[PDB]
Amino acid sequence: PSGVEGAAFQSRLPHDRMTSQEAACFPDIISGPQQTQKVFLFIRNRTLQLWLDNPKIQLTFEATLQQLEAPYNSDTVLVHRVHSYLERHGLINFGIYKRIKPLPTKKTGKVIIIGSGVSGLAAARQLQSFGMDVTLLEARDRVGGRVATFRKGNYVADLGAMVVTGLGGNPMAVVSKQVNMELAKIKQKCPLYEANGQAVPKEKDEMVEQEFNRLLEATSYLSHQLDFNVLNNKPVSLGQALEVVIQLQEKHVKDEQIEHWKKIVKTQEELKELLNKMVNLKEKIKELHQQYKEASEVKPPRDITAEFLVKSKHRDLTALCKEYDELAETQGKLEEKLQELEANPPSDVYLSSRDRQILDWHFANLEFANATPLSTLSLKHWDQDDDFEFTGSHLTVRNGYSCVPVALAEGLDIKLNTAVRQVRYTASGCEVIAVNTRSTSQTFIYKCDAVLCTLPLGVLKQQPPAVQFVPPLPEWKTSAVQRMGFGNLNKVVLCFDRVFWDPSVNLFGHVGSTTASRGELFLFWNLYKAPILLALVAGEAAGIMENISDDVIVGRCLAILKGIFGSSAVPQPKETVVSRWRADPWARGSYSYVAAGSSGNDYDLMAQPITPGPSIPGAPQPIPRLFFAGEHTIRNYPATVHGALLSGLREAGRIADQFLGAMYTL
Amino acid sequence: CRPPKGMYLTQEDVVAVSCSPNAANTILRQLDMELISLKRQVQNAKQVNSALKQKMEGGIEEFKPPESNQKINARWTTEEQLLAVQGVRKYGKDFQAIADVIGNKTVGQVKNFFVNYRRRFNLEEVLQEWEAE
Numbered sequence: 001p002s003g004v005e006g007a008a009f010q011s012r013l014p015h016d017r018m019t020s021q022e023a024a025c026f027p028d029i030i031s032g033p034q035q036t037q038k039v040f041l042f043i044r045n046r047t048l049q050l051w052l053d054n055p056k057i058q059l060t061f062e063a064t065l066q067q068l069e070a071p072y073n074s075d076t077v078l079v080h081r082v083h084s085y086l087e088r089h090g091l092i093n094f095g096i097y098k099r100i101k102p103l104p105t106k107k108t109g110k111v112i113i114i115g116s117g118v119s120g121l122a123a124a125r126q127l128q129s130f131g132m133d134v135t136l137l138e139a140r141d142r143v144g145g146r147v148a149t150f151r152k153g154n155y156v157a158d159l160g161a162m163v164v165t166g167l168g169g170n171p172m173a174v175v176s177k178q179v180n181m182e183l184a185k186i187k188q189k190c191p192l193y194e195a196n197g198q199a200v201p202k203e204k205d206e207m208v209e210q211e212f213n214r215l216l217e218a219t220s221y222l223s224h225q226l227d228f229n230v231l232n233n234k235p236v237s238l239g240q241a242l243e244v245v246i247q248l249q250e251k252h253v254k255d256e257q258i259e260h261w262k263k264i265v266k267t268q269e270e271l272k273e274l275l276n277k278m279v280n281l282k283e284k285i286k287e288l289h290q291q292y293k294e295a296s297e298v299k300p301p302r303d304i305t306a307e308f309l310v311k312s313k314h315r316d317l318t319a320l321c322k323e324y325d326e327l328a329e330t331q332g333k334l335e336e337k338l339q340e341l342e343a344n345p346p347s348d349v350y351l352s353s354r355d356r357q358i359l360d361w362h363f364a365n366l367e368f369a370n371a372t373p374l375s376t377l378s379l380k381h382w383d384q385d386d387d388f389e390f391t392g393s394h395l396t397v398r399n400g401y402s403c404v405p406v407a408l409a410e411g412l413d414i415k416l417n418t419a420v421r422q423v424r425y426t427a428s429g430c431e432v433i434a435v436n437t438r439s440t441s442q443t444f445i446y447k448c449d450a451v452l453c454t455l456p457l458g459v460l461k462q463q464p465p466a467v468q469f470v471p472p473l474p475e476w477k478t479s480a481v482q483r484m485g486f487g488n489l490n491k492v493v494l495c496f497d498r499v500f501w502d503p504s505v506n507l508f509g510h511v512g513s514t515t516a517s518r519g520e521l522f523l524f525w526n527l528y529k530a531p532i533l534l535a536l537v538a539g540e541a542a543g544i545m546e547n548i549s550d551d552v553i554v555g556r557c558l559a560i561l562k563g564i565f566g567s568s569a570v571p572q573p574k575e576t577v578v579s580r581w582r583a584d585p586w587a588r589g590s591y592s593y594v595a596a597g598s599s600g601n602d603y604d605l606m607a608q609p610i611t612p613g614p615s616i617p618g619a620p621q622p623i624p625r626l627f628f629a630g631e632h633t634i635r636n637y638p639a640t641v642h643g644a645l646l647s648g649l650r651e652a653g654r655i656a657d658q659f660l661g662a663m664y665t666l
Numbered sequence: 667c668r669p670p671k672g673m674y675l676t677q678e679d680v681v682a683v684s685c686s687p688n689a690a691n692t693i694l695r696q697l698d699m700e701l702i703s704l705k706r707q708v709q710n711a712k713q714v715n716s717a718l719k720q721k722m723e724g725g726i727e728e729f730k731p732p733e734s735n736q737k738i739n740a741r742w743t744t745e746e747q748l749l750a751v752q753g754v755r756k757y758g759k760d761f762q763a764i765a766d767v768i769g770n771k772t773v774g775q776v777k778n779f780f781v782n783y784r785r786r787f788n789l790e791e792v793l794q795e796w797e798a799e
């Protein structure tokens with residue numbers, strides 16, 4: 001869309017309606033009469049626009065009111081209320097902007113932030129922007145977390161997040177303006193290449209693909225229409241449902257052949273009985289002929305009964321011969337109708353093998369996109385975040401996505417090599433205990449009014465705990481941590497000295513030999529300037545391959561690629577790197593997924609802050625002290641960068657409302 | 667709303683396949699057995715039908731009597747009357763057959779004859795006789 005509605009959309013908001021968030025802060029307005037709502041909205045969308053039109057400079061309340069026209073700049077408190085709400089909730093002046101009003105001399109409140117992820121950094125910038133005093137603690141020796149970007153010489157390749165899943169409503173759109181990421185569209189065209197090394201032909205490719213997509217809509221039908229969501233007191237997975245569907249699809253193929261042959265045999269039984277009828281007519285006729293012969297051999301002159309005998313038998317015979325001719329006509333029909341049938345049989349099979357393996361690749365691609373075996377996705381919910389998908393082509397960061405955390409990191413008090421071991425949060429404030437990753441005898445204590453925790457779900461799930469909560473997290477929280485899924489997927493980076501692949505193709509698939517190994521090296525991206533090929537391990541494979549030497553893995557790749565392009569064309573690689581995310585102790589996996597047995601709800605539970613009980617008993621209810629952000633906290637944009645980035649924006653808003661109060665609500 | 671076209675799934679079939687871990691294989695084997703058991707069964711009746719086709723070799727051409735194409739003529743000679751009376755004894759009221767025997771009489775003049783002479787040839791007695799058979 002265009003103009004002010006463009007901004008509402010590009011900010012993930014309905015242009016013609018106030019959101020629940022807005023209702024909460026402007027209850028006067030939304031309980032109020034329609035007219036004021038439209039004003040409020042326009043003022044909102046308009047302000048958004050202005051920010052969006054130029055996100056490299058802070059948008060001030062002044063600049064905003066300045067640019068509004070009447071009737072709308074008549075209410076200059078409303079304008080401020082709105083402008084201030086947007087600023088708080090990071091819908092404007094987020095990311096990296098030129099500050100017009102240099103920072104408040106003196107800072108209010110102290111926050112310790114765990115993890116220099118994107119979620120961490122985006123929060124920390126805001127809070128700093130809001131005057132708070134913020135320090136980030138990061139176990140690693142660099143920012144970004146799961147935004148990791150390999151660099152040697154001109155080689156540059158992302159071992160974590162590399163795609164920008166569309167700019168229509170994506171905050172990263174804004175950030176790309178504020179930071180030079182070299183965004184290159186990805187050409188979706190991906191040719192597959194069987195186990196052997198031979199391209200799959202168009203005909204198959206499309207037959208199979210369409211079956212894939214058909215199979216999915218199928219699963220949906222089971223789930224919503226047939227309510228196939230529990231089975232033997234356990235929640236149904238996408239995988240289960242897919243098998244079931246495939247089963248039924250086979251069962252039908254057979255069921256049809258059956259009723260086809262049942263028609264053959266039944267038509268044979270027609271033909272048989274007619275042949276007996278015909279062979280016995282043969283008999284009577286042959287004989288009746290004799291008698292006519294004999295009667296006719298008696299010579300005239302005959303008396304009449306003997307004359308009659310001839311004529312009688314003559315007719316009786318022509319009669320039967322007629323009957324036989326008729327049946328020979330009928331026979332000719334059943335005989336040819338019998339030939340139509342064994343000429344036109346139903347489908348031999350549901351899917352060959354060669355296809356059912358190609359189909360297995362369409363599954364690896366799904367397991368790769370969800371970082372998990374489809375045995376583990378919720379049937380009902382794996383795709384709940386679908387409605388919120390952005391618009392536009394997907395893109396890559398061509399100079400490496402790390403450019404972003406690094407940008408965000410700029411100006412922040414980040415402590416690297418600092419691994420939190422314990423988080424204590426009391427009615428009167430919190431202390432965080434950390435150690436130096438390098439020498440762990442060295443201990444640090446950090447006191448603060450609030451803690452924002454961006455620890456990965458993997459890290460939260462860890463048993464025994466890498467991080468201790470004192471007091472323990474309430475069971476409502478810890479269950480959501482079990483219930484949720486934290487998946488895995490790895491990348492192998494192949495740096496070469498020359499391009500031996502098709503440069504007009506960005507990505508291309510390899511089809512695995514088995515179902516159980518459709519993960520291994522099933523896809524290759526060619527996305528960077530330098531001659532680099534990137535190979536994904538998805539599915540049940542990523543898990544296992546983590547236990548295999550790099551050399552082996554790189555071997556297996558060259559294999560695959562030699563098979564595709566010929567042994568003379570596949571040099572050794574100059575440089576290779578291989579991720580092992582599940583092993584990585586500051587990640588313990590790759591990204592969240594909607595486990596079977598979980599719901600989008602759990603993601604909301606993840607974002608609910610924790611409020612310590614009272615110090616002295618009988619003392620009144622405290623403030624919330626412990627806060628959660630990160631990719632697993634954000635129901636509608638989980639497992640992404642933008643979604644983390646947003647979760648971070650969210651918690652900064654919420655923490656400032658808490659500790660700096662919120663003037664805009666009256 | 668409805669499964670994509672050519673995808674087939676029923677409450678009963680889904681329930682059916684799910685019941686047990688193996689119910690899937692079980693069900694699909696019966697269908698596989700039951701197929702071969704009809705494929706063989708077609709194999710038989712092929713041979714069997716081919717056997718009886720060997721028995722009808724030649725056809726019935728060698729048994730086709732010569733045809734008589736003699737014109738109608740409604741003048742009843744005495745023997746034609748006699749042929750008729752005998753027909754009744756052999757055919758009952760099948761006046762078509764009877765006319766076929768007589769050779770030059772349509773199917774009516776036969777009914778005619780039937781009711782003209784029905785008294786003088788006792789064609790009622792002749793029918794009662796044919797009947798008791």
Ligand SMILES: Cc1cc2nc3c(=O)[nH]c(=O)nc-3n(C[C@H](O)[C@H](O)[C@H](O)COP(=O)(O)OP(=O)(O)OC[C@H]3O[C@@H](n4cnc5c(N)ncnc54)[C@H](O)[C@@H]3O)c2cc1C
Pocket residue numbers: 114115116117118119120137138139140143144145146147159160161162163164165418419420421454455456459466467489490491581585586587589590591629630631632639640641642644
């Ligand atoms: C292989 C892979 C590919 C991906 N691809 C994409 C993609 O293509 N597109 C996309 O949109 N998203 C993608 N993602 C998801 C995206 O990278 C993450 O969702 C996002 O970076 C999350 O940031 P975060 O701040 O929530 O967590 P993180 O980025 O992990 O940050 C958390 C920080 O916590 C730190 N930490 C952990 N334990 C401690 C401790 N005890 N003390 C101190 N610090 C600690 C970690 O070192 C880390 O820096 C991908 C993820 C992976 C693994």
